[PDB]
C-alpha cells in the first residue's frame, strides 16, 4: 500500500510503519475497548490477529473523534476527542506515536483498513493474492485517480515574497520545519477546504525530495528546478467521489444579514468569483459558477484557482493526460457540446424519449395478436455506443439500435423454423403497414439479418423516427427456443456442435442480451464513469483493430470487470484511472487457470458460494476438455450467464493473444516511459505491424459531419 | 416479399392441415390395429420422434 514509516508531514505517502503496527497490536493486547475489553488474544494466530487489528483500526477513529490511549508502565482505552491529526496517546511517555504522518494519510489508511476489511471478511471467494501479492504502489495513477503537478519557480528564499503568496512568519516556521513543510500543510488545507464534498481523498507528495546529502556538504545543496529546497515539484494526487465531479456549483453557507465568520472565510478564500445567488428553491446561498468544458474537468479549474490564488501567483499546473484523451473521445454535434461534460447523458435520454413515444404509438394500436412486451436491447440503451447518439447520424453502423418485441403466448404458430420466422416477418409487415397508414411521420423499411447462422428468412423492421433516430425490431416468440432445442435433438450426431453454436448465438442475441442490458444499465447509474471508460476502450480496441472478431458485449464485460470488482483499488473516479486499471488487469490476467467471475451488483442478488462453485466447476471441466484454449480463450461468467461461454465464443486465438500481448506491451510502456502526450499517442498508434497485408480504403465521401462527431 | 410469404403461408397451411387430417382421420394397419393418437397432435413424424425420444 506504500505506507513505510518515513513521514507524511514532509509531503510523501507514508509515515505509518511496521513498529507502529507492533505497538498497536501489543496495545490492543491488554484491552483496546473503552472498558479495556480485550481486542487481541494470542489464542488465535496471525490471521485473526490481523483481522482484529484491521477491524479496530477501521471501526475506531484516531484523527477527529476518539483515539487509543495506553501507558507502558497498565490498561488501554479509547478516549473521546481527536486532535485534528492521527493520534494515539501513550501516557507513560506522554507521546503521540502516530504523529509521523498527516491527516490525509491517516484518512486514506483508515480507508484501506475498511476496504481490505470488506474484501477480507467475505466467505465467498479467496483473494489472498488480491490483498497482498500485488504491489499497488508501483504506479501513481493506478493507486490514485488523477494527478496534478504543481511547478513552482520561486527563485530564492528571499525571492519568496514576490514569487509566492503564502505566509512567512515566526508562527509558521515554529510549527513547520521548512519551506516544503509549510507549503505542504497549507496546500492540503486549502485543497481540503476548496473541494470538501467534491473528492474522496487528497494526497500531497512533493517529488524530487530526497533524504540524501553527501559527506562534504552541509545540506542538500541542490538546484531543484527554480529553488534550492528539497523537492522538485508537487504531486497533488486526487481520488474523487465520482458523483460530484462535474457539478458546476459548489455551495457555501447561506445569507444571514450579519455576515458571520463562515461566509466571511468563504468570501476571503474565493475572492471576486464566488457570490450569493438565488436558486429555483429560492435559497440565497454562497456559491460560484464553474464553466464546465468537455476536455477539462472542473476539478482541475477549481484546483487551478486554489493554487494560483493562495500559495503562488505565477506558479503553473501540469495536467495534460485528461485533455490528451478527452479529444480521443468523440465529440458529438450537440448544442454547446464542448461545454457539456462527459458525465452528461442527454443524447441517450433524447433517444430514450424518442423510443418512448414510439413505444406509446406501437402500444396504442391493434394487431391480430397483441404485444406482450417490447424491450430495447441497444448499446445506446445501455450507454455504450461510440457515437454519443445525435439525431440523423446514419454513418455509425450501430445507428440502428435493436429492440426485441414479443407478442403473447398464442399456441397458434407455424411449426418449422423458416415458417415461424416468416410469420414474424408477416407481423412486421402488418405493423409497418399500419405505421405508414396512421403515423406517416415515421418511415420504415425491411432488412435481412444474418447475425444468426443458417436461418435464411429472418428480417428485421427498421424505422426512422422523425425526432431523428433509427430502430431495428426483431420479433421473439415462445416457440423459437424449443424449436432450436429440438433441432439440436434431432440433428445428425457429427453435426451437433455447430447447431449448438447457432443456438448459442441465438441465446446471446435474443435471450440473455435483455437481462444483460438491464443489469448493466441499472448499474451504470451507480458506477458513473462506465460509459466513458467503455467508449474509450472501444475506440482503443477499434484503432488496434479487434472489433471484427470480438463482440461489443464482451468488451463491455471486460470493462465492467474492474468496476464490480475493483479490489484492492478504488472504484475509478476518472477516465484514465479506469482505462489503465482495465489494461493493467487484462495484462495481469491469464486464461489457463483463470476464469472471470463477476457479479454486477450495487456497492456495499449477489453470487453466493454454491453458484460460485458451480461456475468454477463448469469452467474446470470446460477447460480440461479444452486443453490450452485452442478455440475457447476467455471465460466471462456473470450471474446472468453461469455458462460463461456465451460471449467468448468465436474469437480466434491470434486475436485473443494479440489483445493480451497489447495489454502487456501497454503496461510495459506505462512502467517504463511514464505518462506523456507521445505516450498516449503511442498507446493509440495502430500497431499495424505489416503482418502480411495492408489495404487503404476511402469511400467517395467523408462521413464525420454525417456521423455527427 | 408480401406475395412471397403469402404464397409460403398459403402452401404451408395447406400441407399442415393435410398432414393433421391424415394423422387423426383413421389409421388401421395391414392387419387390424387402430393406432392410438393424441387429441390435438399434428404429425406422424411428430409421434414417431416422440416415440423415439421415449426409447
Amino acid at each position: 500500500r506504500g505506507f513505510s514509516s518515513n513521514m507524511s508531514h514532509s509531503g510523501s505517502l507514508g509515515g505509518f510503519g511496521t513498529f507502529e503496527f507492533t505497538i498497536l497490536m501489543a496495545a490492543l493486547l491488554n484491552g483496546g475497548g473503552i472498558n479495556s475489553n480485550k481486542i487481541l488474544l494470542h489464542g488465535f494466530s496471525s490471521y485473526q490477529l490481523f483481522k482484529g487489528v484491521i477491524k479496530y483500526l477501521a471501526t475506531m477513529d484516531l484523527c477527529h473523534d476518539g483515539h487509543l490511549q495506553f501507558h507502558s508502565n497498565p490498561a488501554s482505552k479509547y478516549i473521546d476527542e481527536g486532535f485534528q491529526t492521527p493520534t494515539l496517546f501513550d501516557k507513560s511517555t506522554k507521546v503521540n506515536i502516530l504523529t509521523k504522518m498527516t491527516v490525509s494519510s491517516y484518512q486514506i489508511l483508515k480507508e484501506y483498513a475498511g476496504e481490505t476489511l470488506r474484501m477480507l471478511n467475505n466467505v465467498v471467494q479467496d483473494q489472498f493474492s488480491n490483498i497482498f501479492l500485488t504491489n499497488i504502489s508501483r504506479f501513481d495513477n493506478l493507486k490514485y485517480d488523477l494527478c496534478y503537478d504543481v511547478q513552482l519557480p520561486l527563485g530564492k528564499y528571499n525571492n519568496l515574497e514576490t514569487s509566492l503568496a503564502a505566509t512567512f512568519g515566526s508562527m509558521e516556521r515554529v510549527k513547520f520545519i521548512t519551506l516544503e513543510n509549510f507549503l505542504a500543510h497549507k496546500i492540503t488545507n486549502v485543497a481540503r477546504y476548496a473541494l470538501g464534498d467534491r473528492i474522496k481523498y487528497i494526497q500531497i507528495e512533493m517529488v524530487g525530495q530526497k533524504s540524501d546529502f553527501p559527506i562534504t556538504k552541509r545540506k542538500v545543496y541542490s538546484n531543484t528546478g527554480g529553488n534550492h529546497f528539497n523537492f522538485d515539484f508537487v504531486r497533488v494526487k486526487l481520488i474523487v467521489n465520482p458523483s460530484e465531479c462535474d457539478k458546476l456549483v459548489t455551495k457555501g453557507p447561506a445569507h444571514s444579514e450579519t455576515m458571520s465568520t463562515e461566509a466571511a472565510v468563504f468570501k476571503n478564500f474565493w475572492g471576486i468569483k464566488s457570490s450569493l445567488r438565488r436558486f429555483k428553491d429560492g435559497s440565497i446561498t454562497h456559491c460560484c459558477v464553474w464553466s464546465t468544458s468537455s476536455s477539462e474537468p472542473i476539478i482541475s479549474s477549481i484546483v487551478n484557482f486554489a493554487l494560483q490564488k493562495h500559495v503562488s501567483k505565477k506558479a503553473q499546473i501540469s495536467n495534460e493526460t485528461i485533455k490528451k484523451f478527452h479529444n480521443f473521445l468523440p465529440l458529438p454535434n450537440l448544442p454547446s457540446s464542448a461545454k457539456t461534460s462527459v458525465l452528461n447523458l442527454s443524447s441517450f435520454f433524447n433517444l430514450k424519449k424518442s423510443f418512448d413515444d414510439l413505444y406509446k404509438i406501437i402500444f396504442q394500436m391493434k394487431l391480430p395478436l397483441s404485444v406482450k412486451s417490447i424491450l430495447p436491447v441497444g448499446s445506446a440503451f445501455r450507454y455504450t455506443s461510440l457515437c454519443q447518439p445525435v439525431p440523423f447520424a446514419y454513418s455509425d453502423p450501430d445507428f440502428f439500435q435493436d429492440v426485441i418485441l414479443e407478442f403473447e403466448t398464442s399456441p397458434k404458430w407455424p411449426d418449422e423454423i423458416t415458417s415461424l420466422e416468416k410469420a414474424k416477418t408477416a407481423f412486421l409487415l402488418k405493423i409497418q403497414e399500419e405505421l405508414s397508414a396512421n403515423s406517416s411521420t415515421y418511415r420504415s423499411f425491411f432488412s435481412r439479418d444474418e447475425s444468426i447462422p443458417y436461418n435464411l428468412e429472418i428480417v428485421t423492421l427498421n424505422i426512422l423516427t422523425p425526432e431523428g433516430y433509427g430502430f431495428k425490431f426483431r420479433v421473439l416468440t415462445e416457440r423459437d427456443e424449443i424449436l432450436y432445442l429440438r433441432a439440436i435433438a434431432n440433428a445428425r450426431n457429427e453435426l451437433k456442435p455447430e447447431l449448438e453454436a447457432t443456438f448459442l448465438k441465438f441465446t446471446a442475441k435474443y435471450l440473455a442480451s435483455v437481462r444483460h442490458t438491464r443489469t448493466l444499465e441499472n448499474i451504470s447509474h451507480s458506477y458513473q464513469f462506465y460509459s466513458p471508460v467503455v467508449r474509450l476502450f472501444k475506440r482503443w480496441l477499434d484503432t488496434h483493430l479487434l472489433l471484427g472478431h470480438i463482440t461489443d458485449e464482451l468488451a463491455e464485460l471486460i470493462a465492467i470487470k474492474p468496476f464490480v470488482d475493483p479490489a484492492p483499488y478504488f472504484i475509478p473516479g476518472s477516465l484514465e484511472n479506469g482505462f489503465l486499471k482495465v489494461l493493467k488487469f487484462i495484462s495481469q490476467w491469464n486464461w489457463k487457470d483463470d476464469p472471470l467471475i463477476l457479479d454486477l451488483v450495487k456497492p456495499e442478488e449477489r453470487l453466493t458460494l454454491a453458484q460460485y462453485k458451480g461456475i468454477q466447476m463448469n469452467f474446470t471441466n470446460l477447460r480440461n476438455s479444452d486443453p490450452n484454449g485452442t478455440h475457447l480463450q476467455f471465460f466471462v461468467a456473470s450471474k446472468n450467464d453461469p455458462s460463461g461461454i456465451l460471449y467468448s465464443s468465436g474469437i480466434p486465438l491470434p486475436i485473443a493473444t494479440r489483445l493480451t500481448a497489447l495489454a502487456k506491451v501497454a503496461v510495459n510502456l506505462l512502467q517504463t516511459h511514464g505518462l506523456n502526450q507521445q505516450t498516449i499517442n503511442l498507446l493509440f498508434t495502430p500497431g499495424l505491424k505489416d503482418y502480411d497485408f495492408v489495404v487503404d480504403l476511402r469511400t467517395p465521401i467523408g462521413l464525420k459531419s454525417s456521423c455527427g462527431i | 416479399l408480401k406475395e412471397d410469404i403469402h404464397t409460403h403461408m398459403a402452401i404451408f397451411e395447406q400441407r399442415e392441415a393435410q398432414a393433421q387430417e391424415d394423422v387423426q382421420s383413421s389409421i388401421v394397419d395391414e392387419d387390424g390395429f387402430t393406432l392410438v393418437v393424441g387429441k390435438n397432435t399434428k404429425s406422424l413424424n411428430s409421434i414417431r420422434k416422440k416415440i423415439l425420444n421415449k426409447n
Binding site: 391480430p368 395478436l369 398464442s410 408477416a426 407481423f427 402488418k430 | 408480401k2 403469402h6 403461408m9 397451411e13
Partner: peptide, 10 residues
Amino acid sequence: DVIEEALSRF
C-alpha cells in the same frame, strides 16, 4: 387483403 391472408390462423 394479402397481409390479412398472411395473418389468418391467429
